Write a protein that binds this ligand. Structure first.
Ligand SMILES: OC[C@H]1O[C@H](O[C@H]2O[C@H](CO)[C@@H](O)[C@H](O)[C@H]2O)[C@H](O)[C@@H](O)[C@@H]1O
Ligand SMILES: [Ca+2]
Ligand SMILES: [Ca+2]
Ligand SMILES: [Ca+2]
Ligand SMILES: [Ca+2]
Ligand SMILES: [Ca+2]
Ligand SMILES: [Ca+2]
Ligand SMILES: [Ca+2]
Ligand SMILES: [Ca+2]
Ligand SMILES: [Cl-]
Ligand SMILES: [Cl-]
Lengths: 151, 152
């Protein structure tokens, strides 16, 4: 596939590819009764200087991607990147696409002089864990994630 | 009994000195090795960002606790998320409600701003932090794994 596959970092004139990726997230994550935000909101997000999206393309079809947030640090002038979502179309999994997305993401942030990139996976998702373990991370740590649903 | 002396405040752009005090508190409580604080130009730039909010606890004008939080605009909703990144309380003033009041003020702030959710993480080996967050009425907790790629 590495003759056909293209990895692309989205820019501000890439809203259609971004929407395609959000729809892939909806599909792969099996999100229920999802209503996509209006395009104006999604464009503002894409225009943020702390947000970077990477996609995998076959021809003009988005077949995978990931989203990431920049966290400027107070411990270092070298920022963190937080990978928020990563998905590959079920029809194109096990073809190296996820690994290529992680590699491209980390290379980009390396060139930008970042300290570290990190990502979260659920402890019961053994295949996600297998995947991230195969990308040669520096460290892996058990974490408890808490949230507060606001009124 | 500091209940009537404790002040909880959200840092403004003129609060670099309190921000630096908080960062030193983090260095002490988290026992950080070989820490060189970034220069103040960088720290001021961060404090100036409109997607970064710091809450502190004060006894008089001494910082005795605080937390840092990042706004994450979503593509799943127009309502943002807030990510609490660090929270610490002076070892001399722990287990006296300071952490709880910081979390309450933080969630109240983001509620008023119409955010969807505030989230925070603790290392599984950090028994103290886990018992703390479980005492703040979180909506839920999830067992997860973090993977880190430290860059050259
Ligand atoms: O495909 C596996 C799961 O991916 C997502 O969940 C991960 O990413 C979330 C957003 O950063 C985290 O909150 C979560 O802890 C991770 O597991 C997706 O939301 C899940 O539905 C998928 O099953
Ligand atoms: Ca493009
Ligand atoms: Ca799933
Ligand atoms: Ca921009
Ligand atoms: Ca510098
Ligand atoms: Ca030393
Ligand atoms: Ca500002
Ligand atoms: Ca979730
Ligand atoms: Ca280096
Ligand atoms: Cl894959
Ligand atoms: Cl406390």
């Amino acid at each position: 596939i590495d003759n056909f596959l293209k990895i692309e970092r989205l820019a501000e004139n890439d809203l259609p590819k971004f929407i395609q990726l959000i729809r892939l997230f909806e599909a792969v994550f099996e999100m229920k009764n999802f209503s996509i935000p209006d395009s104006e909101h999604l464009q503002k997000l894409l225009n943020q200087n702390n947000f970077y999206v990477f996609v995998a393309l076959l021809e003009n079809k988005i077949v995978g991607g990931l989203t990431s947030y920049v966290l400027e640090q107070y411990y270092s002038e070298k920022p963190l990147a937080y990978i928020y979502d990563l998905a590959v179309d079920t029809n194109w999994q096990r073809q190296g696409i996820g690994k290529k997305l992680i590699t491209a993401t980390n290379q980009f942030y390396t060139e930008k002089g970042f300290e570290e990139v990190f990502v979260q996976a659920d402890k019961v998702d053994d295949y996600a864990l297998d995947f991230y373990r195969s990308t040669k991370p520096t460290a892996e740590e058990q974490v408890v994630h808490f949230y507060y649903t606001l009124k």
